[PDB]
Amino acid sequence: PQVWQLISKVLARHFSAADASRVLEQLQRDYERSLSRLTLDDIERLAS
Amino acid sequence: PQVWQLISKVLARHFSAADASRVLEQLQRDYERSLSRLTLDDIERLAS
Amino acid sequence: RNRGGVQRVEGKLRASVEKGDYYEAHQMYRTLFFRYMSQSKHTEARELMYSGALLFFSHGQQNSAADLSMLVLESLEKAEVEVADELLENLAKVFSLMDPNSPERVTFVSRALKWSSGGSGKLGHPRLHQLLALTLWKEQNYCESRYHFLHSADGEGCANMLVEYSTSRGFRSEVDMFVAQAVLQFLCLKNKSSASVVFTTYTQKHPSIEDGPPFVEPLLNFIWFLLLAVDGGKLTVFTVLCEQYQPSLRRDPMYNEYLDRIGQLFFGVPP
Amino acid sequence: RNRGGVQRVEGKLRASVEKGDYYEAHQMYRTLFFRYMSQSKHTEARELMYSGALLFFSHGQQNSAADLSMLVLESLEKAEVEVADELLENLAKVFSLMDPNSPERVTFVSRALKWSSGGSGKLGHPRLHQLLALTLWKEQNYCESRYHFLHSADGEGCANMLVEYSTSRGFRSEVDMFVAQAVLQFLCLKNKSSASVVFTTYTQKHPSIEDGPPFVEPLLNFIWFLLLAVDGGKLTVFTVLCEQYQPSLRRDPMYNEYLDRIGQLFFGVPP
Amino acid sequence: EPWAAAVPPEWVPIIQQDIQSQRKVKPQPPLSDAYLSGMPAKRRQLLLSEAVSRAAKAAGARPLTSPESLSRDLEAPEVQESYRQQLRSDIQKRLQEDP
Amino acid sequence: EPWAAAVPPEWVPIIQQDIQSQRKVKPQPPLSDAYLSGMPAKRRQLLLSEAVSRAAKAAGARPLTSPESLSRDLEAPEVQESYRQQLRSDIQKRLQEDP
Amino acid sequence: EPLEPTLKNIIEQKSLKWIFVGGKGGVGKTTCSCSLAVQLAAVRESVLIISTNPAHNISDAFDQKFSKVPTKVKGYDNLFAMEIDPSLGVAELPDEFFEEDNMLSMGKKMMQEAMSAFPGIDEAMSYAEVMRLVKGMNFSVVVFDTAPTGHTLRLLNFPTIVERGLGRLMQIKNQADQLASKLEETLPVIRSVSEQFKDPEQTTFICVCIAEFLSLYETERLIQELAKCRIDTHNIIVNQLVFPDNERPCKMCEARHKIQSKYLDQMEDLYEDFHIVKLPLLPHEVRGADKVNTFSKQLLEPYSPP
Amino acid sequence: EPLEPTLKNIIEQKSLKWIFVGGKGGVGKTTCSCSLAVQLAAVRESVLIISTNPAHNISDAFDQKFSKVPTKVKGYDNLFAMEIDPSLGVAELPDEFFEEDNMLSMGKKMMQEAMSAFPGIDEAMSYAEVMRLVKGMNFSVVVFDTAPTGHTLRLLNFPTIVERGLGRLMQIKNQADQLASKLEETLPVIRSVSEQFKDPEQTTFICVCIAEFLSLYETERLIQELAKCRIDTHNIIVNQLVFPDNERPCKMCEARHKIQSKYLDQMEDLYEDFHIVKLPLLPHEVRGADKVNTFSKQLLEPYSPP
Ligand SMILES: Nc1ncnc2c1ncn2[C@@H]1O[C@H](COP(=O)(O)OP(=O)(O)OP(=O)(O)O)[C@@H](O)[C@H]1O
Ligand SMILES: Nc1ncnc2c1ncn2[C@@H]1O[C@H](COP(=O)(O)OP(=O)(O)OP(=O)(O)O)[C@@H](O)[C@H]1O
């Protein structure tokens, strides 16, 4: 239903539970910061 | 009458008495060593 | 007879231009330029090269015209022609006719600036910087135009173009930021008068800026007080202004090091 | 039809050689060599190049023959032809026909030695070193010939040529010196048998050396005792011999460092 | 205030106001490329696989099976499309905050 | 002698003789280029002006007027020819010691 | 029986990307390269021609000056031309907002003028451009108006030696961090160019020559050098041939034809497994787009005299 | 009125030592240089010819291979020829009497192969040879079968830039001792070569070209580059001209003559103060000593058709 659940399912086998949770929080952080640092050039790059 | 006297006369004006004597002894040393280290190749070079 | 060859070459060049053989005419122009320079006829060679470059521009022969303009710059350099307003205008016009995306414009600009007051500043008469910046502005090349303004001595046009640039590509929260940066940069180049005039014009003309020295934006008030202090020359005032307005100055980090220059330049702060 | 071109080229080369067009024949030889190598006919190409080099040598075309000999070496390298006595003899003969002052001899010697037992030693079969040294000796190039002897495995010819070299260019006070050096150098290359045989032959044949193991010259006695000790392998004997004969060993300074190797190589002296 | 001693007196009021505002202003958002172009500075995540790899590296998480197996398992199928779709929506959402 | 202990006894006499000779042999003269060529080593005065300059430099003698004036004063005239003539004789003399 | 005396193979080999035209000086490298590029433009989506020769003549050949950046060739929509710039990157416009430290600006400059003055730079610059192209891949194929045999071979050897040296450096890396990152970034592209230059299907060499002793044997030496470099080459452009006419024979043309026939028979015997395409000496200057197109037509269509 | 269309000035200028023959590729640099060397040999006590072009053809031109060291040219007693060797100094025969430390031997070797592989080496090697010649002065005059305009200009610029860099190093020397001594030893010879190359009476440049657009304008560009380098040049060799005969006109020769006459008039108008010597296209191969001598005779004696 969401990318988070797919990532959790994949990491359940490709990473340990603690490692999977740490990676998930790490990626959530990266996503949040990317949103905080969004600009018009970034939108243009996404369009490309 | 000899190269030594000519050198002494020239150094009397181009060098001080002590400097002239030191240079004379220095050159006498160099000449003596060149004689001590004479070889056939050196003779050939002189011929050239 | 010795001079006849050059005359015949000139006639052949005229015939080739009439026939439309533009590349051959470009080569003949190069040969004539070199012959004239060898004869020390620097002014005649420069005029010929300028005319040929304009002619090739008219016909769309961009590369040939660029090469002839570079030859014009070479003549100016070799003859040590004293900088003059007319020559700067000619160089600016030649640069304008070029293609913005071509590196030939970059090379021509660099060489012209170096020749113009090559002793110091890389400015020539800022009139050249002003002309290049105006040409870029009409081309809507805001970055290069703003840079040349920064190295120019015209603050009114700089303020107008800053208003336009902020309105078009700028953000709601950066309206003051822009001018502040420009002002600091002007002051980083010892042009305090340019900073004052650009700040005045930008504040007066920008719709989002309420006219009046006591601006709502803290940054604008800081910039105005800083200009006044720089006029005064008191280091204590500069330190107080920097300290009190730290939250706003932290909006753009470079401001900090910009300030490090200002105190050194207008308040005697040791490096 | 595909193979016809090479045959026609060979016929044209034969005709050119008959006509005396030697440079054209050299170029045709190069082309034939490359074609044959492309076909993996390494042996045929090598034979052709050897024959052509000999032919050009006969006619005095030194540079062409040298180039073809270099091509022979290239064929040997590329085909990884196993070292054989006949090939070494052929290479030595080719090198002999060259001009002593030409660098082509240096390059050919270097390449041939590298190909010959390129795994280790730069010796090939010392038979090649012996042949090159003999050719140089007949040319009275004592320096290079002596070097090759040092890297050869023939001590009798080395002793004979050392006698000749000392008699011709040597001095009265160096008669022993020469052989001693050679012996040490032989021992510096792990060829103790060569050292023994060369010392024996040089002592026996040199008129100025009185035949007999107990020589009048202290240096010769030292060398004989050193050979005997190296056969024994006792470090104490080596140290005693070095210490007692120090005045004579000091005649040639290198002897000292030469000795530093000997104890390391034949008596286990750590470096 | 002490700093008021050096500056001309008539400057003090405005500065005070600014100060009271400055402690309240929300920090500067990301700067538009237009403004960044003026600055002399040029030091102002590709796909979910690369994002997850970067996350693991930053967290120092050791893959159990392998990262290549992780990448091969998905291969950007329809079910995972959601991610980029989410991106769109997310960026679409941002279009509301700065209209 | 102590060193005789290690070496075979029959070696001792000759060595002893050598020793007694070795303390008496006059040192090795300069080596002929022929012998030097075998050695792997290659670190085995132009005119009276250059010789005197080298002598002054080795002695650290400061010229009073100048070295250029010294060189210009002579310019290798007939009177100074003696020097090279002397050289000849000197080398000629050496030809007697090694005939 | 023999291979067709046409460059039809070059056009048909759609995978071909890098094409080098070389040989002895004055044999027609520039004109033949222009003709080949024109023919390719009629097939490939887009084609570039680069004048690596420091004495660029593509501007002369097409009667249209070309900058150091690819520019559309007049008369064609998908044909681009460029001349390699020996000069290094121009100095960036100063900011001079901060302390005017000369350590960076002056040092970089002096390095740049020195490097530009050194000879090898020419080939080096060309090689650099190649790297850029591999990074870009903007053009389907690129032809090279290479310099004569010597410097052309130097350039073609440059990638392999550079790759070997880079591998050595990597093996002794840091035995600064930004430099290591740049080296790691550069290694892939250098390896790719080295592999492509050695792949017959990706690149090939066009040997253009005239029927003369010097030209023929220079071509032979170049072919052997390429074989050493493992660069594929299976076609030779014989140019400036003379075909006499019985209508009005003249001694000059007759003797030149005799000489060229001797050396052309030599070439045919020597160069089996090669496409020997024969081009005549046209009585008009081969300059301008139309002349080059007409010449290229006979380049692809075998020439047969009246 | 115009300067005599002969190289008589070159022969008469007995002070001339360094002579460079250059121009567009295939114009006849090799043959013209050989002819000039042959003519000089008949006057000067001894003359050398050096093939700086990596694609040496003097061996082809004289039908006599030449090594990398000057060798007597067959048929002449005071004429020598050599081909520059791109390869560096060969490794000396090992002594291996002492510890086989690789630090020196292996490092020097790897440096030498790397340097040999780099392009610029070619010109560099030539420059090195020039230095040697200045140290030797064995030959009265030396002619150069230089490479095309680009690399020839690179080589001719090399001395000045090397001298400037050496001066910079000297000014920041030791800011090792054996290296400083070598640098001090080298500075005089580098300065001397730089001065000689810039002295009109000691050196000059022979511009050989054909009557065509590309060749003509390449020659013009080279002349301007030389003027930048301050290298004297006051004579141009127009080669491979065609002189039609009314006895049996042919279209090929007639059109070629028309084109060459157009460009020769262009040259005459452009190149006042130059000795424009015109050479025809001989109907026989210009190879071998006798052919080159015959060709040189008309090179010095102005050609006049029947
Ligand atoms: N088939 C031909 N017919 C007529 N003229 C030709 C022909 N081929 C070449 N030419 C002319 O001959 C001269 C030499 O050719 P070109 O300039 O193409 O040589 P190149 O190999 O590019 O030379 P370089 O190596 O000096 O760059 C030029 O004028 C060219 O126009
Ligand atoms: N006047 C002439 N008559 C006939 N053939 C000529 C003439 N001049 C030159 N040639 C021939 O034309 C070809 C090109 O000339 P040459 O090899 O001398 O050129 P180059 O300038 O040395 O060339 P490169 O720059 O490639 O070394 C050679 O075959 C030469 O023999």
Ligand SMILES: [Mg+2]
């Ligand atoms: Mg060309």
Ligand SMILES: [Mg+2]
């Ligand atoms: Mg040549």
Ligand SMILES: [Zn+2]
């Ligand atoms: Zn004809």
